Design a protein around this nucleic acid. Structure first.
Length: 57
RNA sequence: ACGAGAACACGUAUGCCGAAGUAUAUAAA
């Protein structure tokens, strides 16, 4: 049960409704979506990291 | 399998214009 720390050094747009909107934190929805899209881009197998991983916001 | 994805804060125009470094100032002894 490890935790990850994120440093950016470049400004980030995270969005709620419109591109001119700004939000500070994002939810496990967008995070899990990103992990899924990068898993598919890598061409790895998705079953393992679909129904076993629990992510906090 | 991210309220996403396309997307040059771009284009036009300058330090310009009138102005004298002048006026007196026995090269005495």
């Amino acid at each position: 049960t490890k935790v990850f720390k994120l440093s950016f050094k470049t400004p980030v747009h995270f969005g709620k409704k419109r591109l001119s909107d700004g939000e500070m934190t994002i939810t496990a929805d967008t995070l899990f979506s990103a992990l899924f899209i990068e898993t598919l881009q890598l061409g790895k197998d998705t079953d393992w990291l679909l129904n076993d991983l629990i992510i906090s916001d």
